[PDB]
Amino acid sequence: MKCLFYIAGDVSNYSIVNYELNGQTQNTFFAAHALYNLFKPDKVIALIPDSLVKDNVSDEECYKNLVINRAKELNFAGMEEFMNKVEIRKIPNVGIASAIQCENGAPKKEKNKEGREVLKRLPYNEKRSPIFIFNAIYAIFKDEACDEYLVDLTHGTNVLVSIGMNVGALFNAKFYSAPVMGMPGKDSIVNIVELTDVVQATNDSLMIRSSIENLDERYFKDYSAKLSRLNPTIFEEEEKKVLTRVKGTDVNVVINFLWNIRNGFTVNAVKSMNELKNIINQLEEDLEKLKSFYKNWEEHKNFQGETLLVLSDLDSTLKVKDLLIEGNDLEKLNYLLDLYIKASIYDKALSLARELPVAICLNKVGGGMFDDKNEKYKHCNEIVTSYLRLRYSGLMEFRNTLMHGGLSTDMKPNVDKDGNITPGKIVTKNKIEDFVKRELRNYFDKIVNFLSSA
Amino acid sequence: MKCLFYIAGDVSNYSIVNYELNGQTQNTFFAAHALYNLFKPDKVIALIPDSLVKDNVSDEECYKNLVINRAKELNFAGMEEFMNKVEIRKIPNVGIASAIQCENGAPKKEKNKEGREVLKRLPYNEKRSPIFIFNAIYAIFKDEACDEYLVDLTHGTNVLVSIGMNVGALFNAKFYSAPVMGMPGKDSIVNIVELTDVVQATNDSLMIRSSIENLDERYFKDYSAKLSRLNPTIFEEEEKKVLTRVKGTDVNVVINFLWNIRNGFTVNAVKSMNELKNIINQLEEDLEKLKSFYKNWEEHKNFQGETLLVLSDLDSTLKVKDLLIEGNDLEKLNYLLDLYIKASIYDKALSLARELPVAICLNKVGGGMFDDKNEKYKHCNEIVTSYLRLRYSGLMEFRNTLMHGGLSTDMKPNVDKDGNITPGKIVTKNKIEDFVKRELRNYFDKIVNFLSSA
């Protein structure tokens, strides 16, 4: 079931216009109705700020009438069957504001000196926390028990619109706003902007940045499809050049790189680091071009209506450069070890710390396969394992524990007659954390320094 | 290098008022100015929207001057360090607007019937995608090469303020807005809201929800400290009882649960399932109370200045319920197995898939410790290990491969004298993904079904 939320703003000012989206318009005066008529939401929620409108009796009914009174001053069609269905929720606000009074069920008047006016004279000053407003709006949103969320940010302060945005963001809301910018009077058409793609673009980028940070590809948003269907109707020879370049950037290689690093295919990931260096070096110059293009945006108005191309998605992808290093595969794996310590992926860091000295040893002796049939390996492993069980006894103990997990001979849990397990060792969250993140890099360098002589 | 970013909008309608924030009071008509004084930003970016100014040779100074002209008009004592040391950048806009048209510095006046205010252009056919505006603003933000980002959203349209916020979110920007809404009058005590916490609150919630989805405590934002310093001054008894309840919710248990699930301490993760069922059941009722509190926010005006309590942080924590099940530790580990398949954590799923049948066997034979000294275990393991080596050759091969990783005897890579390494048995991302996510559960159930007979 669809749900449409809107910010009340002020209905007394604005007039009749032609609100349009997707080549379809509506004959109305207020933003909310145009969207309502086009989308057919099962519920419609109004957000009355505590400042604007104060009835004493029922602020909920006062606005309900304030709307009908502006409909009858322009003699509009319908808007009465609409009003019955709308739920009206009071929302807080902050700062000085033009607060209008309400006598019992309708706004009182106020002759003033010349014209005709309502009650609006030094009616509001209030200091609030925006998180309070946030919580209040969140509460309303949560309790509506909606499936599809639709938000109208047309009216209301930059503070309420921004707050309303962040709330809606947590309900996967489609955001809409009609840029007013004064008033056209009658016979003017207004285009409703959709601010959902901008909100997704930013989450996508924050998530993509953590994929790299925490070596986890499950957080990387695959904008390959966004790029594949990206093809505007009008384009110059310089912009067609760069858009064809961006359209074919191998994002899947970046995703695969993360998948290998995550699942511990350390050898495969290290071989790629060169391919990726080239992928991101091409993306860097594609992006620098796209940047001067958007820095001098007025010369390039072709992208003016294009949605699918978003800089943040690509720029956030360039962070994968932080995962690459130059050198031989052994030097690349050495850096990968550090990366596994930085992101707190303890198990992969330990296995790499314990096996990398064997591959180092195998290089010193001219090379060989990581097989028990290989003589060079057979002894290299024996030296590492033994020097490794003589000193650095702890490293192996941890690596083992983490490899097998809680349900294993290394943890010695006890299964009872009934079906309940009682552990046999204590999960030392802090000696793992402390050992890996502090001592282990030193314990590896000390090992590697020892086998250099070999 | 601190960089203050703000939307100029119109300076002609700004009254000379006073600004307060964190015990510091600066008096300027526009918020940016005030913000400059107390923050002392190394750079100041004006972000001039295209619609509000229109000049032939270079409008970037038209505004430059529009500001200076409104300063000398009411004889401002400051503006010296601000002006001539402020950058300006041209930014796009949507809908219908158009305003101030200028020559070579200063705005063009008009007489009409009565008055002497600047003639504003009326047509504004600018239909452009918000993502375009987003990219254009992003470009400006990226290229300033700033360390600390500060954004002023007090000025600007609901579309620009929202777009500006999503950009500023990607630069770890402290957001500020001075709520006006109507004419406030010269020399008015107006304070500026900080929206940074609302923007963090939402990212924190999206991340917390992911931490639960992907069984990764690295994504869980620990709001324990936020909750520990949460002490409002005036609070009614009903408010104090509920706030003391929330203030002492064991978020660390939720974090620990995720840390164990992530690092494969499967027994401990399952043991604490019951504790957490109670933690979240207590949180559910605290949250339901906190909800009606914020639904009837007009009655709980004690929290209106409170910034440390955030509903979204707690509500997102309730998602951890999706990780819990009821039953004996064996039934609890069985669910944990599927959770490991759902989140694509292949390594832990396989280990649990292999060892869980052993513990299942151990239960049938009256119980025993997961030690080689235990006879019941010794043979249970032998049956499990053999049946898999017999019927499920595959599982045992993948489990082994993932435990040791690419650089090991299970992958057989080969080291060269140069140090270049080539992967051996080379296993594909889709071989693993498909096996685990498709055939792995059925294969477990088949093993489990067999050992029931034992």
Numbering used by the authors:
A (entry chain A), B (entry chain B): 1 to 454
Article, verbatim:
SisCsx1, as other members of the Csm6/Csx1 family, is composed of an N-terminal CRISPR-Cas-associated Rossmann Fold (CARF) domain connected to an α-helical higher eukaryotes and prokaryotes nucleotide-binding (HEPN) domain by a helix-turn-helix (HTH) domain. The SisCsx1 monomers are curled around the two-fold axis to form a dimer, and three of these dimers oligomerize through their HEPN domains into an equilateral trimer, thus assembling into a hexamer. Each dimer contains a cOA4 binding site at the vertex of the triangular assembly, and a catalytic pocket located 70 Å away inside the triangular oligomer along the two-fold dimer axis. We show that cOA4 binding activates a cooperative sequential catalytic response in a hexameric SisCsx1 complex and that the RNase activity is switched-off by Ring nucleases, which cleave cOA423.
A cryoEM map of the complex at medium resolution was used as a model to solve the phase problem by molecular replacement in an apo SisCsx1 crystal belonging to the P21 space group. The Cα backbone built in this map was later combined with an iodine derivative of a better diffracting crystal of SisCsx1 in the space group I212121 to determine the structure of the apo SisCsx1 to 2.9 Å. The cOA4 binding cleft is formed by the loops connecting several secondary structure elements of the CARF domains, including residues in loops spanning residues 6–18, 28–30, 47–54, 92–100, 153–158 and 178–188. The conformational changes upon cOA4 binding induce a reshaping of the loops, so that the oval cleft observed in the apo structure shifts to form a cruciform pocket, in which the cOA4 is bound. The active center cleft comprises R354, D372, R389, R399, N400, M403, H404, T409, and D410 residues. The SisCsx1 dimeric arrangement results in a symmetric placement of these amino acids, creating a diagonal electropositive stripe flanked by two electronegative regions on each side.
